[PDB]
Amino acid sequence: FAKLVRPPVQIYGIEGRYATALYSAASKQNKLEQVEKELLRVGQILKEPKMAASLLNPYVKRSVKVKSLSDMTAKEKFSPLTSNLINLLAENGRLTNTPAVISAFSTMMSVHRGEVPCTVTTASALDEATLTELKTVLKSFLSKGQVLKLEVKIDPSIMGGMIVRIGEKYVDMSAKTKIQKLSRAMRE
Amino acid sequence: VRSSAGAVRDAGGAFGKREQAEEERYFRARAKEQLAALKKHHENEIS
Amino acid sequence: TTGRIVAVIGAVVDVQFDEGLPPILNALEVQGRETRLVLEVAQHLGESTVRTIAMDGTEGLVRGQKVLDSGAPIRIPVGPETLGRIMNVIGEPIDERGPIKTKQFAAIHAEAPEFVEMSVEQEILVTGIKVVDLLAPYAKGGKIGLFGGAGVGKTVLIMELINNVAKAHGGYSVFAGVGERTREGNDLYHEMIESGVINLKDATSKVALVYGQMNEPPGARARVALTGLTVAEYFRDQEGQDVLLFIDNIFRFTQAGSEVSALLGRIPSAVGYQPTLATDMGTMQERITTTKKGSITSVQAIYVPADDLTDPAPATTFAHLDATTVLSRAIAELGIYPAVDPLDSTSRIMDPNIVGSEHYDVARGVQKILQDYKSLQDIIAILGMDELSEEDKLTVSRARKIQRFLSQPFQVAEVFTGHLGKLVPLKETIKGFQQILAGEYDHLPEQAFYMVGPIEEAVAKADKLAEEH
Amino acid sequence: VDLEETGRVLSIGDGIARVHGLRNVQAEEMVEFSSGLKGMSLNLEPDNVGVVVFGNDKLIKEGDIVKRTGAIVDVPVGEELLGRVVDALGNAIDGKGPIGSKARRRVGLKAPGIIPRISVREPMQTGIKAVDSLVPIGRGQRELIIGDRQTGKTSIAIDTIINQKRFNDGTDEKKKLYCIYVAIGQKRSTVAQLVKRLTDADAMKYTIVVSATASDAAPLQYLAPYSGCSMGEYFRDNGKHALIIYDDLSKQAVAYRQMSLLLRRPPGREAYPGDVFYLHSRLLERAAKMNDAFGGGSLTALPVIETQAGDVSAYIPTNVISITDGQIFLETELFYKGIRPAINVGLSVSRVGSAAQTRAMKQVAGTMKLELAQYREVAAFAQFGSDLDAATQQLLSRGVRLTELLKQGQYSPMAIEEQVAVIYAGVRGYLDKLEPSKITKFENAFLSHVISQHQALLGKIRTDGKISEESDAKLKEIVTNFLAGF
Amino acid sequence: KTGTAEVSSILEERILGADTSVDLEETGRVLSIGDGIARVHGLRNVQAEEMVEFSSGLKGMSLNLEPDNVGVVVFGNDKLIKEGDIVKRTGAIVDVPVGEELLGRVVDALGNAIDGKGPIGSKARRRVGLKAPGIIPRISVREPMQTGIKAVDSLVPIGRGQRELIIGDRQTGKTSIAIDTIINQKRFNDGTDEKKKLYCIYVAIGQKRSTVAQLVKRLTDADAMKYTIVVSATASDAAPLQYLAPYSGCSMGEYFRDNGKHALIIYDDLSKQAVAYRQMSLLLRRPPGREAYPGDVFYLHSRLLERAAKMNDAFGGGSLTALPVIETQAGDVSAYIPTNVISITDGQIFLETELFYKGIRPAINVGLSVSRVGSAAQTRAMKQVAGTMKLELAQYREVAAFDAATQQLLSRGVRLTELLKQGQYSPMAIEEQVAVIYAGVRGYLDKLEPSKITKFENAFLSHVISQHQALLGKIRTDGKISEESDAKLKEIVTNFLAGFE
């Protein structure tokens, strides 16, 4: 019944439980960046095609899976929480779904780093100078810790306007939407 | 569906109870008849 | 390998074995249990631990209990040599006599009779039974289903028929108390001791004891089907003797596989049974019978618990029952003893090409007459014998007499039925049938025909009544 | 590893075959396992395919690498099995060996369309009096057969076959036809008797063996509908009139039920899923005649219906009725009341139609059925019997005479024209004075008298198919001699 | 399956390697605290069906088992349970103190008194894990048992070690039936024959506190409760509790009867046991069945019923007797409990609450009871009387709904059935029963109107006792067919009836 260190971000799923556990594990010693780099590296280290094949090999023993995993983790000189977490996830068979947990923990550590979401879309993409200007425009809406991580986008499907997702805020100035409202009016 | 022969008697409710009881009454009448006839026949065979 | 207790609510257990899962029908013993606990590998789930059919009480086990992997079904000796004691399907002689070791020992999972190599004829296995001969004479080595209920005479008529035939089995024989009472087990032991067809100390065992009792859980109580099939195969070849087989009861047995299906998570049938519970039971019915080197005059009890005539269990029962023994528990309620469902049971030896034209025709006319009896019974219930027509009151008396002549009190029944058994002769039965067709007791009371043997014996009984009147 | 046309057993139990691999393998194919077990999968999971153990796969341990042979259900075609006992797996039935049938017809047989259908006109060889009388079966008909335990259903079938096998042994140019009838869910003793009698009744002369044993694989039970469909289509597209007998039918229903149940597919009512419509009608709707374009063959079908305590509302029966172009209601109590044939006649019905009805036999039945209904109309009154209205009494006697004639003989097919003649004599009122208990033996003896003497007039009517008033009178007089002289 | 510890609750100590210290044999944290469905962190080395003791003293019955998580049973009202709680698994098959010090002491299955009569004085703790008797161990038993009601001993003779099954539904005097048996079982237990002196067992499942106190007042008033064991599973009896209460009776019967006690157990109703076990399985989310009830209740209830053995010479010579009483739903013979008992019982009793609806109190469902045991455990004198009485009552029933001679027969049989009746809570010795049996076999008042016979029967019992109480004890001790006592009975019958008018 561990009062596991919930990262600034909370996740869900088996990936979510793993992410909370890893947030507790790293936050114990706060190795968020360190084990984070470790995990970024492991994302390919295990992505060794033969490694994935053996893990995906149903005719491969889960015990043997954990054994080869321990060999490869010592090969990475795995961090203690990281190594025993790798062992535990292999025991769960989470090796099948390990990358998702890695991504979730990444989101958790990024939000720990104040990962303010943002997504900039419009009738298209636009000027980079205008891009910085709109980033500043959102910044006043943005808050403390809110660091501009925007998702720029070009969308001619958007008849017009600008679809600005920011954290939770979704500012879709879309003149396609304006057109929809206008048609609604044109009926009446 | 179908209806059985003696379907009520098959069910045997109060109607079937009456069936049983009237069987008792009439068959007992006939039984006393057969028994008396047999007593008469025994009387006849006595001589 | 060797399985190790992993995680299970009881017998539904995948035991951690270092290598993979053994082949099908694998039954392995639990190393580290209180007794020899053989568990049957049954779920090819892989995982080096197969959810296995454990027939024993799982209590006391600790997770990690490393068990002895065998890899196949139980092997115990068979043949007429094992006759004389009472042994388990695992071979455990529960006759308090230690291993009654025989020669022919093998596993139980096997195939059915061949598509070209079995027996292809039917010989009326007559026993002189009043009702059975009267209408539904049996035949040699067929699938005869004993449609009776619980406490419904199935064991009572079973005692009568055992007394009748079992003392003189064609060869050796076998009897299974499949979910029979433990009290019935001890009583049947005393009865076999007093029966001689199988003798406890003496080697008069023309019979074989077997128990699948109700206090024995399904894991065994549901499992003895293959044991019986193998024993029948032995009597076909290994015991190699003209054998009738007793096995009771299968309702709780097929129901036992049903209860097992839940642990299997197997789909509930209409009665919640395993979806393939029928598959096995029909296949169970296909294993060992009359063949070229095969012969099983096995008696099959068709338990209709809860008197559910159309039970899905009764459905599968009728599905392969080459011979039908339809009890009329209503008749017994009417005091019938015999009490079968007359116009209901089917038997091939009741045919003009088989029973002869005379006997089959007589039986069919009897069925028609009884059908009229039922029909007009309600008709009377409306009116009564006041309107009893000449053809009708005659029909009424005749049908009452037929019902009376149908039953007989046996000597084993004479324990309760008082009247000792009457060894009904077939010709005597047909003769009484013809005489009743004539009306052999028109001036007499039919009550003499009730619980009676020969029709002449009934005439005597009626004269005795004339005395007692 | 293989992931296109070979899988590896992932996790199983009770033959629940879902293997890893053969993802690119085609759907609905009977392929060999790692134990070589030629078997079919349907439940193609995203990760695997649910494969049905085509029988018992005890020779297949877990992890087995099943090679998806890409082989769909293909079963032989051609009349080589007519008379030969074979099993659907290319095996024999009675151990009757190679029928001399070589080919195998893929499961890809569809039912005929309206154009591919042919108008049915064949008066069926029924060998049961009322069977041909009230309503025979058309060229490729579709009539249900409602029955219960040991109900004589197979016995009615034997009467039909005995009427059929003669021309199956015979050559009548319009009667040239193919025969195949299932003994599905059959005990070993039952099937042995079936083969032995087919020999004895000479039905093993022109009949292609169909049956599902009690030990028959549930997948085998399922394919048996398709098996019979392809087998019939063989001679049907070969222009030969063919016959199917889904006997039984409910067993394969429970079979596929257990199948999908293991598959964890949705149960449906009584655990019966929609395939009772889909899979079952998939073969059922083909009960027709292949067009002259489709060969001119006729695809008769004789499904067997188990009346589970008269489970009239069976979803099985439910689909059947909505599909039934005919049904066989049986008054089994009548057999229990001695009347075997136990005809549930007012209950019996047939929607196939009279385009296959002998206008002579049709003329006979037109009055016979009306009289039967009228008797049935007040047959309740017969109970009291007394003071019977003279019209009512006469209607009853006609019905009483028919009841005398109502019975039937097991494995005793007869000439249809013979029954036509008997009913004609009744229509003459020529049976009004025969005591019903003896009127049966009477009709039988008159039948013998004709089959000796009026056998000439019998063939005259038969080949004639036209009731010459003079030929009618000649038969009438032959019968009058036989009966007055009976 | 839901990864129970896939949360950092254990996974944190897993990745941090901090979990190693957990007691992983017979203790630990709660792998799942919820609904009393207990999964324990570790204790995988615990025995199966073993005992679990929470750190809060609460008892746990671990039946289901994940690898270390489990399905254990909250033996109590756990409104105070906590997450990750510690259950020190006792690792034992359930046992509790046994001994006739309980006979006359009202404790629970675990030996827990509710009436304030003190701690369990019963001697030794017995694990209820009792299997079936052996073929050598078991043999035929036909000794009489305490019936004490006219028709009860008459047609369904009470066998010493016979397992009854008495069909009678809600408010059918089933409790009244048990009380009548006890009053009958009193004078037998109130006897010097240690075989007759029965330190026996009787219970009514779902006996709420009021029901319990009333039954206690009755049983102590009977003072046979002194030689009796009576536990009343009140309205809060736990599903494990009520569930193993029959198993408690099983262990207790092994104790006394297997030590040769000719003793009887009366537990009902196993239908409520089905409700409790199903409540568990629902909490267990286990696969349900008919009425959601498990189909394996067959072998589970067989563990009690199917082991029916009257202690033979190998089992001490006493009797491990049972007296089930069935309760129809709506005459629902095919009810899961009902069909099962039908599918289970080899012999069973049936009461006609419709005759109780007709007003008869008592009202046993004539014929509907089954005595395959037969008269072998009744007086051979009672056996002889019953030989006639069976046909007499049958004919009385056979044409009950009205020859004149047949009318005479029907009048006699109806009057006899009226005579056989008994009051409310009036069980006694079978001596006066056999007396009235001789009266009926002589038809000693068949001319007295049943309404006249209504009091004439009482007057007959009275004048016989005042006339032949000595001859009563004579026929009693002798048991056999006493022609001398028979003639004394004829005389005293002329006295009682003829002198009654």
Q: Which residues of E touch B16 (CB under 8 A)?
A: none
**Helix, strand, coil abundance in chain A, percent, nearest 5:** 60, 10, 35
Determine whether E219 is exposed, middle or buried from the number of CB atoms within 10 Å of its CB (0-12, 13-18, 19+). buried
With contact defined as 3+ CB pairs under 8 Å, the chains touching C are: B, D, E
Note whether C78 and E59 are within 8 A (CB).
Answer: no
Boundary of a domain, candidates C328, C349, C370? C349
Q: How far apart are CA D33 and CA D21, in angstroms?
A: 12
Q: Do E370 and E447 lie in a common domain?
A: no
Q: Which residues of C touch D198 (CB under 8 A)?
A: none
Q: Do E71 and E152 lie in a common domain?
A: no
Q: Do A7 and A67 lie in a common domain?
A: yes
The DSSP call for residue E377 is G
Note whether D100 and D314 are within 8 A (CB).
Answer: no
Per the annotation, does E232 bind a ligand?
Answer: no
A20:E17 CB<8 A: no
Resolution for this model in angstroms, one decimal place?
Answer: 8.4
Q: Do D477 and D334 lie in a common domain?
A: no
What residues form DSSP beta bridges with E262?
Answer: E319
Q: Do A1 and A82 lie in a common domain?
A: yes
Boundary of a domain, candidates E357, E378, E399? E378
Looking up tokens 């009467």 gives D159
| DSSP string covering C135-194 | T----TT--EEEEE-TTTTHHHHHHHHHHHHGGG-SS--EEEETT--HHHHHHHHHHHHT
Domain count, chain A: 2
- Whether a cis peptide bond, with omega within 30° of 0, leads into D325 is no
Q: What is the CATH number of the domain that holds E180?
A: 3.40.50.300
Residue B42 contacts E where some CB pair is shorter than 8 Å: no
Q: Choose among D145, D139, D156: nearest CA to D349.
A: D145
Q: Do A4 and A79 lie in a common domain?
A: yes
Note whether E241 and E233 are within 8 A (CB).
Answer: yes
Distance, C-alpha D308 to centroid of its chain: 19
Residue E8 lies in a domain: no
Q: A177: phi > 0 → left, psi -120 to 50 → alpha, else beta; which?
A: alpha
E15:A4 CB<8 A: no
B1:D310 CB<8 A: yes
Note whether E461 and E445 are within 8 A (CB).
Answer: no
Domain count, chain C: 3
Identity of the amino acid at D365? A
Q: Do C263 and C172 lie in a common domain?
A: yes
Identity of the amino acid at C32? G
Q: How far is CA D448 from CA D133, D418, D442, D452, in A?
A: 20, 10, 10, 6
Q: Do E81 and E207 lie in a common domain?
A: no
Q: Which chain D residue has the Cα nearest residue C277?
A: D258
Q: What is the CATH number of the domain that holds C159?
A: 3.40.50.300
What residues form DSSP beta bridges with E320?
Answer: E263
Q: How far is CA D458 from CA D129, D365, D453, D466, D467, in A?
A: 17, 18, 9, 12, 11
The approach used to solve this structure was: cryo-EM
Q: How far apart are CA E29 and CA A77, in angstroms?
A: 32
Note whether D145 and D332 are within 8 A (CB).
Answer: no
Q: Which domain holds residue C415?
A: 350-467
Note whether E122 and E100 are within 8 A (CB).
Answer: yes
Q: Which of E25, E280, E290, E302 is the best mutation test for C, with the most CBs of C within 10 A? A: E302
Q: Do C283 and C331 lie in a common domain?
A: yes
Q: Do D263 and D247 lie in a common domain?
A: yes
> How distant is the Cα of E325 from the closest Cα of chain C, in angstroms?
17
| DSSP string covering A103-166 | HHHHHHHHHHTT--BEEEEESS---HHHHHHHHHHHHHHS-TT---B--B---TTS-SSEEEEE
Per the annotation, does D186 bind a ligand?
Answer: no
Q: Do A78 and A141 lie in a common domain?
A: no
Task: Identify the active-site residue in D351, D376, D428, D462.
Answer: D351
- CA dihedral of residues B38, B41, B43, B46 (deg, nearest 10): -120
Q: Do D95 and D31 lie in a common domain?
A: no
Residues near A174 by beta carbon (within 8 Å), at least 6 away in sequence: A122, A123, A158, A159, A160, A161, A162, A163
Measured at the CA of C21, the angle between CA C15 and CA C24, to 5 degrees, comes to 115
The number of C-beta contacts closer than 8 angstroms across A and E is 57
Q: How far apart are CA D106 and CA E67, in angstroms?
A: 49
**Catalytic annotation, residues of E:** 372
Boundary of a domain, candidates A112, A146, A170? A112
Q: Do D318 and D209 lie in a common domain?
A: yes
Q: Which of C377, C387, C401 is the best mutation test for B, with the most CBs of B within 10 A? A: C377
Boundary of a domain, candidates D357, D384, D401? D357
Residue E18 lies in a domain: no
Q: How far apart are CA C8 and CA C15, in angstroms?
A: 9
Q: Do A5 and A47 lie in a common domain?
A: yes
Note whether D53 and D262 are within 8 A (CB).
Answer: no
Length of chain B: 47
The DSSP call for residue D148 is -
> How distant is the Cα of B47 from the closest Cα of chain E, in angstroms?
29
Q: What are the structure tokens assigned to D380, written together? A: 């309740």
| DSSP string covering E341-353 | HHHH-SSBEEB-H
Q: Which residues of B touch C380 (CB under 8 A)?
A: 19, 22-23, 26
Residues near C33 by beta carbon (within 8 Å), at least 6 away in sequence: C56, C60, C61, C65, C67
End-to-end CA, chain C: 81
Q: Do A84 and A22 lie in a common domain?
A: yes
Q: Which domain holds residue A95?
A: 1-112
Q: What is the CATH number of the domain that holds E474?
A: 1.20.150.20
Crossing angle of helices E239-258 and E297-305, in 10° steps, is 30
Boundary of a domain, candidates C73, C103, C123? C73
Q: Do D221 and D316 lie in a common domain?
A: yes
SS3 D402: helix
C444:B16 CB<8 A: no
Identity of the amino acid at B7? A
> How distant is the Cα of A163 from the closest Cα of chain E, in angstroms?
37
Q: Do C152 and C298 lie in a common domain?
A: yes
Q: Do C209 and C334 lie in a common domain?
A: yes
Q: Do E335 and E386 lie in a common domain?
A: no
Boundary of a domain, candidates A112, A134, A161? A112
- Whether a cis peptide bond, with omega within 30° of 0, leads into E287 is no
Boundary of a domain, candidates E61, E92, E123? E92
With contact defined as 3+ CB pairs under 8 Å, the chains touching A are: D, E
Q: Do D226 and D112 lie in a common domain?
A: yes
Distance, C-alpha B28 to centroid of its chain: 6
Q: What is the CATH number of the domain that holds C374?
A: 1.10.1140.10
Q: Choose among A26, A20, A27: nearest CA to A6.
A: A20
The DSSP call for residue D453 is I
Q: D245: phi > 0 → left, psi -120 to 50 → alpha, else beta; which?
A: beta
Measured at the CA of E297, the angle between CA E293 and CA E302, to 5 degrees, comes to 160
The number of C-beta contacts closer than 8 angstroms across A and D is 7
Distance, C-alpha C126 to centroid of its chain: 17
Residue E13 lies in a domain: no
Boundary of a domain, candidates C73, C102, C117? C73
Q: Do E84 and E114 lie in a common domain?
A: no
Q: What is the CATH number of the domain that holds E71?
A: 2.40.30.20
Length of chain A: 188
Note whether E320 and E309 are within 8 A (CB).
Answer: yes
| DSSP string covering C289-356 | -SBSS---EEEEEEE-GGG-TT-HHHHHHHHH-SEEEEB-HHHHHTT-SS-B-TTT---TTSSTTTTH
Q: Do D369 and D463 lie in a common domain?
A: yes
Q: Do C47 and C79 lie in a common domain?
A: no
Q: Do A70 and A160 lie in a common domain?
A: no
Q: Which domain holds residue D406?
A: 358-486
Q: Do A24 and A79 lie in a common domain?
A: yes
Domain count, chain D: 3
Q: Do C67 and C26 lie in a common domain?
A: yes
